[PDB]
Symmetry: C3
Subunit: 336 residues, 3 copies
C-alpha cells in the first residue's frame, strides 16, 4: 500500500518472555495490520550446559538460548531494535527466515559492540520461522553458540486444519533445540576458555566432525525436565513450536502424538496428521498441535534416542487429569 | 467405550510370524471392533550380524530383530501379553507409538526376568507405528540392541489413495532397519562379550559418535538376500512397511518406485506419489505401495549408498514375469 | 506401445550443456511423444575441489560433476548413448531413478573401457530424478567420486501448483550437491594419488565415517560464486533443481523462500509452499520455484551451516532491480 498508509499503521511495542513461554498475543488478529515492535539486547556470556559444569560462551539474543519467540500476524510488520552492548566483544546481526531481502536482514543489521540497529520487514508468509545471527565468514560459529530463535507469523484468521476447521490452542510452548560442539582435551575433559574467540579454532575442529557433543532444549541438558517440565491438563489443546537452526531433528511426544503437524512450519502447507514422530530439517522451525487425553508424565524428545538420552535432547510434560482406561489399561500388572 | 462394552467385544488370538513376513489379516476389517490378542516372549541372545562373525547381544521381541509386525484395524483394541523369561538378565518393557498414555505403555509394562504383563490399548489412529523397549535410564541401549518393531493399524475400510480410490495389495513385507554400534579393540577388530551388560560401557562410547558400525535389515548384513530375498511377480501390488526406531533412513527400490508412499506412515495424511526415494525419520515407520512392472532382481536400500553397500542396508526382491520392452530396452547392448 | 509404434515416433537429438545451466527445452510439450536422444562420454579425470588445491579423481558423466540435466516430457522415451572410452580404467553403467526395470538401467548398461551402449526407457512419471553410476560391488565409490546427475521429466502440460494453476519459470538452474570423502595424512593434509585405484582403500575408510570432508555444489567449493554466481532479476521466476545422490541436504535461499517446492521432486505430489528450508533425502532430486522480490546478493545453501560454510555447500545469486522498502527497510542503520 501507499507510503502514507504504511506510516499511518499503528505501532505497538511488545514485552518479550523467555522460552519456553511466549509473550502475549491473540491467535486471530485484532484490528488491521500493525508494526509490532520488539527490542532485544545481545548477551555474550558463559553458561553451563550439563551436570558436569561444561561451559559454552553463549551468544544470546535477549540473554537466552534459544532467543525468544516473537509472534505477529501475516502482513503485520516486525520492527526489531537490536542492541549489541559495548561489553560484548563480537560483531553480530540477525537473519529472519520469515523476511524477504538482504540475507533475511543480516546485511542491514551488522552491529559492533556499542551499536544498535532497527530493522523492519513485512511478515508476508504465515508460519513459524527460524531467525539467527549470521556474520559473514563466521555464520555457523555464532549459530552453534546459541544465537538463534524463531518467530511465528500467524494467519490473520488463526490456525486451521486441512479441511478449514479452526484449530485454537489453549497454550503454546517454544522448544528451541541446540547442537553444541564443545572442545575436549586429550583426557576427554571439556575445555574452558577465558574469552569467546579463544575457543574458535578448537570449536571449528569439533564442528567439522558434524557430531555435536551435546544436543539440548532451552540451552542445557534437563532444562525442560523435573520442576521445569512443561504442563497441560487432559482436554487441553497445546501448540509446540520447535526449531533447529543448524541441524535436523525429529520430535516425538512419548505417550502422545502430533494431531496436526505443520512439519515444514508453514501454515499454507496443510498439516500432516496423527503423527508419531515428525521431522524438522536444520535451518527450520515446525509446529505440532495436540489435545492431551491422558494424565501423567510425558517425555518430548528428538527421536534419535542417543541424541535424546545420551546427548540431552529430552524434555517432559506433566499432565493433570483423569486416566482413560478405554484408551489404555494394564489388564495384568507386571507379575511373576 | 465403557469397561462393560469392551468386555462384550469379540476377541481374536493372532499368531505372529517372523519378519519380513506378516501374520494373516484382512485389509478391510471383518466385522466390528475387536480385542486383538498377541503374545511375545522377549529373548536376550547373541546374533551374528556380518560375515566377519561380528556379534550383537540382541534384546529381541519374539526372538527376532525387528520384532514382528502386529496388524489391527482402527478402533480395535490391541492386547499384548509380554513375557520376560527368567533366563534373561534385564528388565524390559514396551512403548507403542500407536498408543495413548503412560509413555506408550512403557510405564505400565516394566517386567523383570521371570515376570509377564498384559497391556491393552485402543488403536485410535490409522497407520504404521514403531514400538520399542524403553527402560528408564537405558532407553537407547535397548533400542539399538534390536528391541524394536512396528505395528500397522489399517483403516477399517482398507487403504485408499489421495482421492479415495481403494488401494489393495497382493503382498505385504515388513523391513525393520537397525543401526548397530559394535565396539572395536585397538586393532580395529570387533569385540565379543559373554554377557549383555559386559558390553554396555563400550557400546555407549560408540553410540555417542552417532556413527553406526552397521546398518542392516532384519538383523544382519544380507539377511534379506538369497534364501531370504522377498518375492513378487509382474503385476503384483506390494506394500513395503519400513521402520527405524532410532535413526533416519531413506528407502529406495532400485529399478522401481514408491507409487504411493505414506512417508510419515500415517494413513490420514495423503500419500506422496511416484517417489524415487522416500524419507523416514528415526522413531517412525513408513509404508510404500508399488505395482511391479518388470521382472528381475531388485535391490531395496537405504539410499545413503555407503550405509547400503558398506554398512549393510540392502535387501533384494526377486520378481518373476515377462520383460516389458516399451518401458525399457537395450537398443545396443554393451559392445566395442 | 508396440515396437512398431515406438519406431514410428519422431526423434530429437539434444545437445547437453554443463551444469548449472540446462539445455534448451519447452516447458509445455511440443506435439506428441518423442524419442529424445542424448549422448554422454564418461571421463575419469582429476579435478580440484578447493582453493588449497585438493584433488579428487572424479568419474564424470559428460566430463562434469554433477553430470548434466537431461530434460524430457512425461511419456517421451529417453534414449541415451553412453560411452566408456578406452582411456578410462573402470567399468561404469547408469541407473536412472526415473526408469522402470533392470536396476534403473544399471543392469543393461555395464560397459568396460572401449565400449558403448544405448539404453531407451519410457519416462512414465513426472518429476526430477537422480541418475548415477552403480557398478555391482563398487556402488558408493563411483557415486561419491561424482558419478551422478539428474533428469527432469516435465508434465506434458508444463508445471502447475497444487490447485491446478500454471507455474511458468523464466530461468532454470540445476544445482548438483556432492559429498566428497578425501583421505588426509598424519598432518591432517589432504592426500593426492597418482591413479584413482591408489585412493580406494583410504577413501573407503573415510566413507565409513559417514562424515564428508567436502560438500559442494557444481563440483567444488565456491563453484557457483563470483563470475559464476547464478543470476536473476526482481520479478523473475526461477526454478532451482537440486540433487544429492548419496546424502541428505536441506536447501535454503538466504533472503528468499521456496514459493513452491516439490520437496520429493515428484510433480504429481502437490508442492509445499512458502518454504524457508526444504529437505531432499540422499538418493533424490527436488525442485523449488521462486519469484525474486528484492535485488542484491543471495546465498543458496545446504542449511546445516557447518556443511554450508565450513565444508563448501554455498552458492550465490546476483539479483538486479529496485529495492522494496515495504518488504524490508533499515529504519536505523548500525550506529552508536
Ligand atoms: O516414544 N519415545 O521413545
Ligand atoms: O538406485 N539405487 O541405488
Ligand atoms: O538463511 N541462511 O543462513
Ligand atoms: Cu552473533
Ligand atoms: Cu539461515
Ligand atoms: Cu529391553
Ligand atoms: Cu519412541
Ligand atoms: Cu562409474
Ligand atoms: Cu540409486
Amino acid at each position: 500500500a501507499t507510503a502514507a498508509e504504511i506510516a499511518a499503521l499503528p505501532r505497538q511495542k511488545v514485552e518479550l518472555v523467555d522460552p519456553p513461554f511466549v509473550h502475549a498475543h491473540s491467535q486471530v488478529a485484532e484490528g488491521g495490520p500493525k508494526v509490532v515492535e520488539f527490542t532485544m539486547v545481545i548477551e555474550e556470556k558463559k553458561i553451563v550446559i550439563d551436570d558436569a559444569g561444561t561451559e559454552v560462551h553463549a551468544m544470546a539474543f535477549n540473554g537466552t538460548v534459544p532467543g525468544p519467540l516473537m509472534v505477529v500476524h501475516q502482513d503485520d510488520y516486525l520492527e526489531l531494535t537490536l542492541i549489541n552492548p559495548e561489553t560484548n566483544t563480537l560483531m553480530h546481526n540477525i537473519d529472519f527466515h520469515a523476511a524477504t531481502g538482504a540475507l533475511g536482514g543480516g546485511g542491514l543489521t551488522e552491529i559492533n559492540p556499542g551499536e544498535k540497529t532497527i530493522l523492519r520487514f513485512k511478515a508476508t508468509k504465515p508460519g513459524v520461522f527460524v531467525y539467527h545471527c549470521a556474520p559473514p565468514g563466521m555464520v555457523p560459529w555464532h549459530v552453534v553458540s546459541g544465537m538463534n530463535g524463531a518467530i511465528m507469523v500467524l494467519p490473520r484468521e488463526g490456525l486451521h486444519d486441512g479441511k478449514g476447521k479452526a484449530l485454537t490452542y489453549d497454550k503454546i510452548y517454544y522448544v528451541g533445540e541446540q547442537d553444541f560442539y564443545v572442545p575436549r582435551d586429550e583426557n576427554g575433559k571439556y575445555k574452558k576458555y577465558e574469552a569467546p574467540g579463544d575457543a574458535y579454532e578448537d570449536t571449528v575442529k569439533v564442528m567439522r566432525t558434524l557430531t555435536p557433543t551435546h544436543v539440548v532444549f532451552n540451552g542445557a541438558v534437563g532444562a525442560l525436565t523435573g520442576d521445569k517440565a512443561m504442563t497441560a491438563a487432559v482436554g487441553e489443546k497445546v501448540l509446540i513450536v520447535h526449531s533447529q537452526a543448524n541441524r535436523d531433528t525429529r520430535p516425538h511426544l512419548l505417550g502422545g502424538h502430533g494431531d496436526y503437524v505443520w512439519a515444514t512450519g508453514k501454515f499454507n502447507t496443510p498439516p500432516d496428521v496423527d503423527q508419531e514422530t515428525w521431522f524438522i530439517p536444520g535451518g527450520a522451525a515446525g509446529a505440532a498441535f495436540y489435545t492431551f487425553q491422558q494424565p501423567g508424565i510425558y517425555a518430548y524428545v528428538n527421536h534419535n534416542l542417543i541424541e535424546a538420552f545420551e546427548l540431552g535432547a529430552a524434555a517432559h510434560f506433566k499432565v493433570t487429569g483423569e486416566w482413560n482406561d478405554d484408551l489404555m489399561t494394564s489388564v495384568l500388572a507386571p507379575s511373576g
